[PDB]
Amino acid sequence: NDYCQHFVDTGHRPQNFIRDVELIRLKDELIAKSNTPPMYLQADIEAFDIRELTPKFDVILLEPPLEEYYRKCWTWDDIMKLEIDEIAAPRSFIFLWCGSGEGLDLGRVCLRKWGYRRCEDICWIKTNKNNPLDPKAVFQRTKEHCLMGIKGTVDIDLIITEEPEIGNIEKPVEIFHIIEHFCLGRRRLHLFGRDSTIRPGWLTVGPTLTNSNYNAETYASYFSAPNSYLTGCTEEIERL
Amino acid sequence: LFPPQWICCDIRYLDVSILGKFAVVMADPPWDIGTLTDDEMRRLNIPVLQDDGFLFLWVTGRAMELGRECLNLWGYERVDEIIWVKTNQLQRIIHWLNHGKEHCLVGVKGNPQGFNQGLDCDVIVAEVRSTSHKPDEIYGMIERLSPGTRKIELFGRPHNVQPNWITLGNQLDGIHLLDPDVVARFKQRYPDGIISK
Numbered sequence: 001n002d003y004c005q006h007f008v009d010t011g012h013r014p015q016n017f018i019r020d021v022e023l024i025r026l027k028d029e030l031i032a033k034s035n036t037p038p039m040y041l042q043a044d045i046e047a048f049d050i051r052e053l054t055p056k057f058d059v060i061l062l063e064p065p066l067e068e069y070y071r072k073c074w075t076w077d078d079i080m081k082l083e084i085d086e087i088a089a090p091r092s093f094i095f096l097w098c099g100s101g102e103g104l105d106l107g108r109v110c111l112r113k114w115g116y117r118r119c120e121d122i123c124w125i126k127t128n129k130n131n132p133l134d135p136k137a138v139f140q141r142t143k144e145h146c147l148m149g150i151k152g153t154v155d156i157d158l159i160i161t162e163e164p165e166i167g168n169i170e171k172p173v174e175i176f177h178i179i180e181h182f183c184l185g186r187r188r189l190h191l192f193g194r195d196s197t198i199r200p201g202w203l204t205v206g207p208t209l210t211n212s213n214y215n216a217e218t219y220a221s222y223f224s225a226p227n228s229y230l231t232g233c234t235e236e237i238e239r240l
Numbered sequence: 241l242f243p244p245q246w247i248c249c250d251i252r253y254l255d256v257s258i259l260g261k262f263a264v265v266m267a268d269p270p271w272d273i274g275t276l277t278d279d280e281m282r283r284l285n286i287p288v289l290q291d292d293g294f295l296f297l298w299v300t301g302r303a304m305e306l307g308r309e310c311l312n313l314w315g316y317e318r319v320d321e322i323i324w325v326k327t328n329q330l331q332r333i334i335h336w337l338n339h340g341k342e343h344c345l346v347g348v349k350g351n352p353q354g355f356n357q358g359l360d361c362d363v364i365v366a367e368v369r370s371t372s373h374k375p376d377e378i379y380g381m382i383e384r385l386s387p388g389t390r391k392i393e394l395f396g397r398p399h400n401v402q403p404n405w406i407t408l409g410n411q412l413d414g415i416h417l418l419d420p421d422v423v424a425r426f427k428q429r430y431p432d433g434i435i436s437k
């Protein structure tokens with residue numbers, strides 16, 4: 001009945017007991033067909049003029065390495081000074097991983113600073129089925145937030161997975177499925193991605209990448225006419 | 241004085257100074273997303289209700305941002321955020337995305353001492369009942385956090401009244417007060433038993 005009391009008694013988080021955590025295959029397949037080749041660039045983002053990332057992006061996924069993930073780190077001071085508005089398309093979206101502490105407030109300041117308004121709060125809820133603490137915390141923190149913002153004019157706002165091993169900072173790959181299922185456009189940027197997050201249909205930029213293949217001219221050539229306004233969910237436009 | 245107490249009122253106009261100080265405030269306001277305007281929410285006399293303690297503030301939609309504003313304007317710092325995952329009786333979850341959850345901001349004011357922080361986690365999993373009816377689990381979380389203390393709920397309905405809580409709301413049935421200090425201040429302020437203006 002009362003999973004809160006049960007957690008106090010046994011250490012099993014209430015989310016451990018959520019159960020069950022059609023033609024979507026075709027959609028997934030069309031997304032795969034219109035995906036650009038993976039592109040990636042090693043860049044030390046604090047020292048790197050982000051304006052050289054072109055063209056302007058339809059989707060930005062921002063995953064700064066917060067100090068709270070470890071228990072080089074980026075403070076919200078650092079993050080807030082990123083020039084995200086300079087590379088976002090006039091109509092575009094952002095997904096910003098905010099953690100579970102002050103980022104929930106400071107990430108909203110960022111979004112507004114960069115011209116976005118929040119349209120969704122996506123919660124990554126962490127179960128502890130296999131293994132049943134900020135001074136300001138009132139409660140044990142068992143989830144993280146990814147804020148979705150929009151500028152200009154099937155899935156649920158919950159991701160439930162088991163808490164990863166200590167020292168593992170990866171976010172659930174399910175966030176990419178949610179993003180790509182929105183069909184927001186094909187210019188997709190993942191800032192602070194890693195070798196392990198490189199993915200078709202995305203440009204990944206981060207300090208720990210071991211290799212790069214990014215070329216602005218080659219990258220822009222994927223979105224030249226007739227393919228400038230595709231959503232990433234439609235059939236490709238035929239040639240010769 | 242320990243058993244449930246409540247006051248049917250318009251929370252905009254009640255002189256909440258007569259109620260004293262509380263270790264915990266909880267509110268489920270009718271955000272303008274019968275509503276209260278943003279300015280009416282901002283003007284609510286929350287600051288007089290506590291010196292040191294915690295505020296629990298349910299939010300949704302643009303109130304996720306407006307509620308942070310009110311919280312800060314009222315003198316709180318947001319230190320936590322509870323997520324209620326909504327399920328049917330079989331523990332299955334019920335614009336761009338379909339919503340499986342509701343949010344409750346946790347603000348702190350002053351320096352609360354002797355609370356049992358960290359006993360519960362920040363996720364609630366509980367069955368949906370009537371509309372806008374929040375889960376009863378929150379009362380047990382709040383009781384474990386701050387046992388035996390005075391607590392006050394704003395915009396509560398009859399099913400919200402609980403021991404150690406005073407409930408305010410315009411769909412409650414009359415006035416039911418037992419704490420003699422509160423009874424005395426209420427009679428002093430409202431001798432004829434009416435709360436207008």
Ligand SMILES: NC(=O)[C@H]1O[C@@H](n2cnc3c(N)ncnc32)[C@H](O)[C@@H]1O
Pocket residue numbers: 249250251252268269270274275276372395396397408409410411
């Ligand atoms: N969840 C809700 O909206 C609850 O708050 C009540 N309410 C709406 N405006 C007010 C008000 N100015 N003063 C006191 N209570 C109110 C609603 O009648 C409902 O009981």
